[PDB]
Design a protein around this nucleic acid. Sequence first.
RNA 1: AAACUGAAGAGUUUGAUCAUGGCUCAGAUUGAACGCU
RNA 2: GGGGCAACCCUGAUCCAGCCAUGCCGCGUGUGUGAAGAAGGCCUUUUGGUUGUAAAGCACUUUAAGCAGUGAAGAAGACUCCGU
RNA 3: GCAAGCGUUAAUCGGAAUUACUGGGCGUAAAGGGAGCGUAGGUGGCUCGAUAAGUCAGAUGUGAAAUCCCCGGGCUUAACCUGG
RNA 4: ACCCUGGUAGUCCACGCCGUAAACGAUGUCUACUAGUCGUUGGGUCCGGACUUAGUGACGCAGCUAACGCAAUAAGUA
Lengths: 212, 131, 79, 122, 156
Amino acid sequence: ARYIGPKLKLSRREGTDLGLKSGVKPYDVKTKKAARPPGQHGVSRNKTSEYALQLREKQKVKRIYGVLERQFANYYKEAARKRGATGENLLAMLESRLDNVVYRMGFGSTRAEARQLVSHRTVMVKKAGRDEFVRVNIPSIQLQDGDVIAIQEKSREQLRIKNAIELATQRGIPEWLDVDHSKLQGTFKKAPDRIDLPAEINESLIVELYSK
Amino acid sequence: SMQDTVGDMLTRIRNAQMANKVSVAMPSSKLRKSIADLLVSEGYVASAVVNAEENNKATLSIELKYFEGKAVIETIQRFSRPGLRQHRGKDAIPTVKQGMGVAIVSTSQGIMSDRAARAAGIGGEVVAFVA
Amino acid sequence: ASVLTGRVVSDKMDKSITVLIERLVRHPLYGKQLRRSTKIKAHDENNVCQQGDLVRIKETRPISKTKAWTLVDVVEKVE
Amino acid sequence: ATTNQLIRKGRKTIKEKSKVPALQACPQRRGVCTRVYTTTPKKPNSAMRKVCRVRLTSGYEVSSYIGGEGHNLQEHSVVLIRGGRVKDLPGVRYHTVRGALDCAGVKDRKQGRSKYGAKKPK
Amino acid sequence: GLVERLVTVDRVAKVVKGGRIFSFTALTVVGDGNGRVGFGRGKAREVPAAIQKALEAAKRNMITVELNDATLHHPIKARHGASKVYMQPASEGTGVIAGGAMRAVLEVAGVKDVLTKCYGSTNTANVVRATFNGLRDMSTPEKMAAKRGKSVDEIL
RNA sequence: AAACUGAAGAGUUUGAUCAUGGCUCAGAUUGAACGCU
RNA sequence: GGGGCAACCCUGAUCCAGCCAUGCCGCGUGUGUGAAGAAGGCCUUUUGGUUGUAAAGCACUUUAAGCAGUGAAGAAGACUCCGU
RNA sequence: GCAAGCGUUAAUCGGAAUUACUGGGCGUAAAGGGAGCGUAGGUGGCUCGAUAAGUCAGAUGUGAAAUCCCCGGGCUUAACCUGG
RNA sequence: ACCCUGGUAGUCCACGCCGUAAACGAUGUCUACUAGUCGUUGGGUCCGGACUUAGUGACGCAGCUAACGCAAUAAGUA
């Protein structure tokens, strides 16, 4: 499954912009309500507890990338087992998802529209070492060091892809990704480092929550 | 009566340092001297000299050390007691204070520190933990 | 091949002795070694050794219902 | 509790018995109602709670609690009994399953419908 | 530039002729986040005055702890009365997995990854004090070597 | 090269406290059953 | 695997198909854009808040399912013929 | 908050250091036998030897495969399969 | 019933049973070590004192304890 309902009341529950709306308007203009959480009361009394800043920090990362709990608790299980820091191996698995990468590269206005491109067989992946361009319809493919992404010839004249590039340039392009607008082709050169993503996400709260 | 000669030795040292005594003395023995010699060479006590007394008896005197008015030997506990002996292999020697302390090990090459036994790749009876 | 040593606690059978072998089987949870013992009936063809002796016994083909070991050497004898 | 004392006697913990013996380690058991009555709870609070005494297929005859507002149980009603005690009711350690066999789901339930065997309203 | 955090606020009572006099006790842990930490608990009739009084009692009960740049140097087992605590160093990225009382002192003292477990009674005041004793009694390889008159290389 | 990574507590006895000590809870798991879907 | 020189026969082993959300895993039920912030519900200090960019509208996309084609690999080359 | 599932019940371990070997207690919270002698048993002073059973180390054989973990490889991904 | 006046078993003796008490220091026995002060019992050795032993007490450090409190006759360290 995936979350279908309104997107600007997710951000509002987190208290920050989640990039769930393409950046044609400022975040405080698309919703204009983003001071109070959604619903009747929203901004009120009661002192939030340690568990609440843990749940809300993990709910936020899940909402950013669009991954549900069962697929996201498997990621933490891969990141714990894996050598090195858990909360940084987790942020790499989520940034190495094929549906996330065709949005960091500029073919999707937002991850939900980049999820709609990978799933609808409009994005080809080529594993580094192999020479064929397989078509894929699995958003959760973990890219590796050297994988090359390319848009399908049938859907290379997409009117929604063409403006997703325009709008990405303002947002910028990461350094661990090499994009080619003319050839509608990219390259997952490297998994992103911890200091290449926003410092407002506190991954230490995520690892803290998955230990009861 | 007394059935733990090694435990008596450590208890004498533990109480003497708790009482800020300059030195601790007890009847001597090769096993006691071997442990006392290791404490000297590990740097936990100043010196340990054996004085041969009459009637084929000996006295082992150990000079204790204090750092900033505190006893150098913070903890000295016995691991392999007579009621339950503890022998370990070369890879099962328990460390003391993450390598800072000494686990006195009785190997076939004599009493020596745990770091020495691992270097020699040899196990033995872990007789005490001193830190 | 497979020799075992123990004392003789009984020798009142014809061409047969009971040997008490001691072992130190260690407790699997508490680590203390408990000294246990089993009575093995060996075959003494000439019926020479008495009770209280050290005897080596080796496993062989069974000679009786509950006897499959044989005496090979008497290292020690009653004082 | 020395080492010699532990290798002689040894620590013996005791396992607790089941709090729902009539089920015989089964999630639910079916039974026949032999009495459908009401009774009063213990000291702190007051009510008339609905209880049915049911003879189960396991040979036990226990009393289960009919939860919800309204029911349709009488003598010789076939009901599913699950575990779970009622704190206010002494000697009641089972709940009758609503909607299971003869017991009907709570008529006008809307929120916690699956706990009371009520279909989703169209 | 000091980090303060409140551990618990409890409502206590005293009995008099007319009835009960309710007061509030607050236990805080103040720390630099760079090795300096300290706890204190204050009592007042109002919660804000109990919190404020707890902070001042903590800023004067402070210690400096030499950490292993992310975590502790060696496993620690300490106790205050009936609360027994235990802490051991953890790898980087593990995080401070601890109970609310243990987490407060460790997080504000600068520890970022440590494995803890509280035994005995989990009274917040005594657990905070038992952890405080363990952090103050914790030793450094440099201090151990200098205590024996040897070098850190001579003492692995 | 690697197999070497792992440890959280809470509620409830009191006018209040600390301790003791039971009970309960948050986790994981299933050849599962049942209810709603 | 059993029988036979083989041809071949037998094999509810096995290889598959059927039923079941019983479990694990994966995908979907759309995506962008949309404000005097529509109506309806709910609260309300009776006029504001909230459902809420949510909806409508506008522009797209067709994974899965459906329809139509095409189409590997699971096959070990038995027999028969030639040569050594 | 989960999601084609979600809850409830049953059941095991956990949390429970609440049988405590790791890792608890016994003046007053439960807990020292009324006291002693003593059998089996447990444990046991110093020094010089012998032995090598315990202990430690090495080698060799064995510890099936699967499973677990590590490094890889194939299923579009994953579950799955798989080489060392 | 408490109080009063009487009063039998018992209390006493011999020989046997019983085997229990808040049979308590509510603290098993045996070792070694760890500031000190003041009593007291039975010794001993010195010069009215001093010292040293084996008991028996009152205090009081460190240490321990939830606290009370224990504290060389430990509930301290083993």
